[PDB]
Amino acid sequence: QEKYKDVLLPKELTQIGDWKVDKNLSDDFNYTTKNKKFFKKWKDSYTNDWTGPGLSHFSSNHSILKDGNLEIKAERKPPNKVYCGVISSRKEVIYPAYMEIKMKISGLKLSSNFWFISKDQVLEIDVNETYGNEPDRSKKMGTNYHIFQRTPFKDLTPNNGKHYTAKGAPFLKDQFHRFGCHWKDAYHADFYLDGTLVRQLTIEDPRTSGVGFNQGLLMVIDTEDHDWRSKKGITPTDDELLDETINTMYVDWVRVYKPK
Ligand SMILES: [Ca+2]
Question: I want to staple 132 with a disulfide (CB 3.0 to 4.6 A). Which of 44, 69, 104, 107 is the partner?
Fold first, then answer.
């Protein structure tokens, strides 16, 4: 069907210069299995041995290659936990870059995620987070950034979450959409939904050393049970996890472009 190279960049990016592919962080995921080429670019784990948030248990076995998609799976981990698929890049992205995934999010209460995090887990850009179950929120591209204090764990930049509907406000679970980030410099990023600009972000860094987003970030493609939800009693049921209609997040392609 579709290769990521044939899809035009947003006019806003082409107004700025020519762009080339970073092949190490781009994949059509058209492999029939997790082969040598898959493992050259990707690891079928999180960036470190964190097993994940809330009732999440990150699982190498919950990422599948099938029929031109990376499929991100979820299964009951008895008694009350959720095996969550996760892949992350071996190579880092630094500004300026355009990072975009084509995905059909799950229909589960888990978050369907395309994000970036520095090795030391300080710097986080959320290009997309969506809860697939939500009558309203399943329609919303969820964009955010976080600068974390690690030792006494604290978000130094909470409440930066902004939600955007696609044109016509469809349920995002019903079709492939593109979730894009133009990371321009240490303090600026533009977010794009289906190639259209939805957010002009300026980063506010309150750290002693306000250098902003100046580190290499690793790509993460995952699904997660978020603790604030499962603590409110919002978490997939057994029948939901088994419902082949809603239990899978599909990634047709991911791409990362650099100036030429
Ligand atoms: Ca594909």
Answer: 107
Q: Tell me the CA–centroid distance for residue 17 and ligand 1, in Å.
A: 27
Burial of 168 (0-12, 13-18, 19+ CB in 10 A): exposed
- Count other C-beta atoms under 10 Å from residue 117's C-beta: 22
How many whole angstroms separate alpha carbon 157 and alpha carbon 207?
A: 10
E strand or H helix at 77, and its extent? strand 74-77
CA nearest 193: which of 166, 173, 175, 162? Answer: 166
Listed residues: CB within 5 A of ion ligand 1: 28-30, 68, 252-253
- Distance in Å, CA 155 to ligand 1 centroid: 35
**Resolution for the entry shown, Å:** 2.2
Count of Cβ atoms closer than 10 Å to residue 224 Cβ: 23
Residues in contact with 171: Cβ distance below 8 Å, sequence separation at least 6, in sequence order? 138, 139
Task: Reduce the secondary structure of 168-213 to three states and give it as a string.
Answer: CCCCHHHCCEEEEEEECCCCEEEEEECCEEEEEEECCCCCCCCCCC
Residue 254 Cα to ligand 1 middle (Å):
9
Question: In whole angstroms, what is the distance from residue 201 CA to residue 10 CA?
Answer: 17
Q: Which burial class, exposed, middle or buried, applies to 36 when counting CB atoms under 10 A from its CB (0-12, 13-18, 19+)?
A: exposed
- Which residue numbers are catalytic? 124, 129
Cis peptide before 10 (omega within 30 of 0): no
CA 18, CA 109: separation in Å to the nearest integer?
39
CA of 66 to the centre of ligand 1 (A): 9
Q: How far is CA 189 from the centre of its chain?
A: 15
Tokens describing residue 30: 């058209």
